[PDB]
Design a protein around this ligand. Structure first.
Ligand SMILES: NC(=O)C1=CN([C@@H]2O[C@H](COP(=O)(O)OP(=O)(O)OC[C@H]3O[C@@H](n4cnc5c(N)ncnc54)[C@H](OP(=O)(O)O)[C@@H]3O)[C@@H](O)[C@H]2O)C=CC1
Ligand SMILES: NC(=O)C1=CN([C@@H]2O[C@H](COP(=O)(O)OP(=O)(O)OC[C@H]3O[C@@H](n4cnc5c(N)ncnc54)[C@H](OP(=O)(O)O)[C@@H]3O)[C@@H](O)[C@H]2O)C=CC1
Ligand SMILES: Cc1cc([C@H](C)Nc2nccc(N3C(=O)OC[C@@H]3[C@H](C)F)n2)ncc1-c1ccnc(C(F)(F)F)c1
Ligand SMILES: Cc1cc([C@H](C)Nc2nccc(N3C(=O)OC[C@@H]3[C@H](C)F)n2)ncc1-c1ccnc(C(F)(F)F)c1
Ligand SMILES: Cc1cc([C@H](C)Nc2nccc(N3C(=O)OC[C@@H]3[C@H](C)F)n2)ncc1-c1ccnc(C(F)(F)F)c1
Lengths: 399, 410
């Protein structure tokens, strides 16, 4: 008989990840967990048919139920508008969800001992969260100034940005509200306590002494009053770092830390060919609400090959870890030891399978190099899923 | 009876690099090349004793003679004035020289087969370009509610234009203004296009003009309209090209590339994205930098690292050091190669190339300093039998350079 998993918000997506998403639910989730499943179809056609209302409804559902797991979605461009005859170029579902939920996105790579790392000393995962303007054209010579006028009008400060003396150019003003900085701190501290890992904040406060110093000051202030004892209880710590020193410290580290960045990771994973092993999680500052997803997109290029009949080796691990992280967080909110056990076991099974030599083409290329990858070096998407299912069944049986 | 080098402005420096610098001239340059040297001592003693006038003097000579090579110089902080009992926390000579000559700084790592690269697919060097943007920004604290505006006031008395940045309705925060000039973007473009044709590699500019449509669009439009008019004809002769890339597309593209291209970066923190990574990876001694002025003629070449203070203390205390000179050598060779380009000096162009190849081949033959041995075996895992010290390595280079030049007379 199956585990009671509780309230989970699920969002269905597009193209290749949609296929893998259902495979995950059929093969890996539903045979072992029963869910009070709040399910929303963020497929592109249904977003068009509902005028993006389903996107907003999914976000309020995550807000209500604290656990969202999301499949990758097409963000419409002009060519997508014609492909599906869209009513309009709908806004990114991801931007809509985070706008409604707030919080900070943290990315984490999944490490297998048989898989090379970009920096080989990184033997434990590193978790990175980023904090997330008015620009214009200067037609010609003249002063660009930026002014602050307090609501009392008691004073007024006019800062010189630049006096253009030879021709024109460009200029911009940008800002941050304290509250958004504070939320960034709380999410970062909540992430470190949840993971049991130390936390570092990197800034350029040597250069942006006021702008970035505010990030350092608000992080330290919130830490001292609200998290320092909770950190000491888990024997973790928080420290600010100049970005220069953080880069060097990280490259000489073995991993296992949170890195809050004040200035993204998925582009480096894509260059390295490890996007299928990179998970993503949006952490709201309340410490209660989480939205988990893969860091990659719908993998359109693999989906076209699948549509034309050709065989596909798309990596499902990041999509799988979206479910494990969501369910693990659901278990923590509910004190569900059986669900917590299942979520961890599925992560172990995923890593053990790869470390036993059964992997998708991307992983094999990471070991050998793609110009040396023969077809027997890897499994296709569906073989790999079957293999994970066999190994998951065994792991759960052997207990 | 030697190779005629021509007019080169030199800039002497501080501590371990200065020691390296002299070995390079005595062992690698002077025995084969005679130069119209214009030497300036930017050692911090001579900067103090001349009230840092030698620094500004050295810059104009570069503008006069168009080729300069610079040894690493101490930047004065509050702790240096106590060590050197200085009379001022002078500017770093780098910022002085740069704002005088202007132009774009290009970074290039020196690649050896047996020395691993951060991305193994990189078999050819990648050159990063960036104008010499967060450093010229005005930031401040918003202490409480109120309005932040950014305004443009024309110098001809016409109507000022006001842009709202943000209305802080409750609480405060931070705000800042940034800027870039068309003239600097235009120099950036020309310097990049001229670097690509000189090296014979394609060129990419990366912006995020999807987000900063006006700020970064100006970068993209200016590069494109200079390319379409003044360089696309030359670019297609050498089978190369220029193209704009979104920054996140470009990161992935560069990591999948084999190297051998020029990357012009709008938002570039060179101390972070280049030096710090090389510092963490352990290859700062293999990183070179050259300032390319927009005139198409004036360059200043230098190592991308500093005076290596830690090694110098070890050398002062009597201990053996193993300091990598390659980046300092390639400051010379890149300056000489540019001098030969201007003077059509085949004999000097050959010497610069030969010195670059002897440096690379010596390492690929297994003779290297401590840092390069660490890149192979791991930073904490070097034995003394794995490397040569500073002077042992310079001797090995000198011996291989003599043999290389002898075999060239056939
Ligand atoms: N959070 C979200 O919902 C996101 C959605 N998208 C959307 O996805 C669509 C396609 O985006 P695209 O630019 O192709 O980015 P994708 O991440 O979808 O694909 C980029 C490339 O990375 C590799 N890759 C990505 N995921 C995997 C995987 N699971 N297994 C193996 N390889 C993988 C593939 O490279 P190779 O070709 O070398 O195999 C793929 O072609 C777009 O419409 C975009 O809007 C994009 C990002 C995020
Ligand atoms: N262009 C210029 O004039 C610059 C000057 N400086 C100046 O140099 C001084 C020291 O700066 P610092 O922070 O030490 O920067 P350095 O580049 O001098 O040293 C940084 C570290 O990187 C390694 N390293 C650097 N160069 C080499 C090399 N050629 N061979 C082997 N290893 C190398 C050393 O690591 P390890 O200790 O592990 O051996 C060194 O401690 C300061 O006074 C600063 O102002 C700094 C930057 C630029
Ligand atoms: C530290 C870090 C970690 C991660 C991911 C989220 N976490 C992680 N954890 C363990 C391994 C690992 N990765 C690996 O080994 O290769 C692929 C993937 C990685 C994409 F490279 N990624 N993303 C970027 C950085 C990073 C950001 C800025 N600067 C640097 C540097 F200083 F190094 F330049 C590194
Ligand atoms: C160190 C670094 C920092 C930055 C920017 C100015 N600052 C920053 N600070 C923190 C994180 C962060 N990045 C993140 O998280 O992902 C995207 C971006 C980064 C692409 F990683 N970028 N740009 C490039 C590099 C870099 C240069 C060469 N090699 C690598 C690597 F080794 F990673 F391949 C990384
Ligand atoms: C492409 C690149 C090249 C260089 C240097 C001037 N050129 C170079 N050429 C060959 C090898 C080589 N390096 C190597 O092998 O290790 C150390 C050093 C490098 C520091 F990694 N550096 N600096 C930074 C980047 C870069 C900048 C921003 N973003 C990324 C990335 F997209 F990767 F994140 C990479």
């Amino acid at each position: 008989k199956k585990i009671s998993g509780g309230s989970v918000v699920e969002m269905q997506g597009d193209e290749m990840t949609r296929i893998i998403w259902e495979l995950i639910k059929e093969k890996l989730i539903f045979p072992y967990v029963e869910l009070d499943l709040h399910s929303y179809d963020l497929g592109i056609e249904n977003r068009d048919a509902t005028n993006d209302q389903v996107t907003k409804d999914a976000a309020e559902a995550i807000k209500k139920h604290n656990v969202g797991v999301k499949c990758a979605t097409i963000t419409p461009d002009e060519k997508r508008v014609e492909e599906f005859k869209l009513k309009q170029m709908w806004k990114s579902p991801n931007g809509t969800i985070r706008n409604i939920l707030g919080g900070t996105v943290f990315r984490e790579a999944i490490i297998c001992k048989n898989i090379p790392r970009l920096v080989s000393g990184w033997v434990k995962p590193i978790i990175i969260g980023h904090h997330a303007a008015t620009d214009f054209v200067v037609p010609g010579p003249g002063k660009v100034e930026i002014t602050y006028t307090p609501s009392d009008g008691t004073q007024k400060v006019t800062y010189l940005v630049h006096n253009f003396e030879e021709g024109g150019g460009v200029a911009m003003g940008m800002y941050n509200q304290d509250k958004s900085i504070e939320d960034f701190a709380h999410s970062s501290f909540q992430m470190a306590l949840s993971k049991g890992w130390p936390l570092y904040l990197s800034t350029k406060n040597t250069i942006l002494k006021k702008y970035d110093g505010r990030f350092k000051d608000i992080f330290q202030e919130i830490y001292d009053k609200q998290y320092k004892s909770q950190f000491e209880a888990q024997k973790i710590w928080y420290e600010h770092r100049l970005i220069d020193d953080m880069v060097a410290q990280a490259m000489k580290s073995e991993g296992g830390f949170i890195w809050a960045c004040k200035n993204q990771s998925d582009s480096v994973a894509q260059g390295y060919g490890s996007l299928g092993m990179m998970t993503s999680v949006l952490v709201c500052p309340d410490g209660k609400t989480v939205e988990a997803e893969a860091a990659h997109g719908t993998v359109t290029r693999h989906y076209r090959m699948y549509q034309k009949g050709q065989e596909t080796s798309t990596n499902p691990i990041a999509s799988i870890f979206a479910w494990t992280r969501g369910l693990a967080h659901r278990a923590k909110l509910d004190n569900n030891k059986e669900l917590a056990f299942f979520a961890n076991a599925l992560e172990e099974v995923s890593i053990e399978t790869i470390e036993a030599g059964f992997m998708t083409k991307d992983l094999a290329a990471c070991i050998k190099g793609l110009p040396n990858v023969q077809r027997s070096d890897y499994l296709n998407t569906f073989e790999f899923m079957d293999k994970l299912g066999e190994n998951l069944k065994i792991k759960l049986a052997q207990a």
